[PDB]
């Protein structure tokens, strides 16, 4: 769930198998904000939810003109 910079470097191949198994590991760092490792399938599934939501708001905001343009 949370490992340090160094531990990842040395046990990266293990972090892969955890991630592949279904875990979402955080990578903390002494300097700046941290990062997260996840499997591509889950990441991309979350990215699509976000994009889908983004489109929903855009379409809600522009609902009238969107409806109108269908008939032009």
């Amino acid at each position: 769930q949370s490992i340090n910079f160094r531990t990842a470097r040395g046990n990266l191949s293990e972090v892969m198998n955890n991630v592949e198994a279904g875990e979402e590991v955080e990578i903390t760092r002494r300097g700046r904000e941290p990062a997260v490792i996840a499997s591509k399938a889950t990441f991309e599934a979350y990215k699509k939810a976000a994009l889908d939501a983004e489109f929903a708001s855009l379409f809600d905001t522009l609902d009238s003109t969107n409806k109108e343009l269908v008939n032009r």
Partner: protein, 124 residues
């Protein structure tokens, strides 16, 4: 400057057809790639810093880009305003958006005019 990927432009088109109408399953990736390719190229060549010019480019490029045989004006409009929203500009519906988009698609309204109208509506 945040941009829209080819793969997003397609997702946007399919999402729009589902919600508002049109024939689905017909979006050409090479067309999406060509539309974004043109926007990105114009920006670099002309060294465009103005967010509303870039928006206007997405709008004309997509409107005339023929991603499929349906909903190209809608994708054009939405893509342009998605760009704006993604770069921190607040957007909203306006009575003149429909007319704008149609004249964009038919070549009667050029990129600059579309830029001026977006800059008027959404730029301080």
């Amino acid at each position: 400057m945040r941009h829209i990927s080819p793969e997003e432009l397609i997702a946007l088109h399919d999402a729009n057809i589902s919600r508002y109408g049109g024939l689905p399953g017909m979006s050409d990736p090479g067309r999406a790639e060509a539309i974004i390719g043109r926007v990105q190229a114009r920006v670099a060549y002309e060294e465009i810093t103005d967010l509303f010019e870039v928006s206007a480019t997405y709008l004309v490029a997509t409107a005339r880009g023929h991603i499929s045989n349906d909903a190209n004006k809608r994708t054009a409009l939405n893509s342009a305003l998605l760009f704006l929203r993604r770069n921190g500009v607040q957007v909203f519906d306006s009575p003149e958006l429909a007319d704008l988009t149609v004249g964009a698609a038919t070549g009667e309204i050029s990129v600059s005019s579309v830029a001026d109208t977006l800059r008027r509506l959404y730029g301080s």
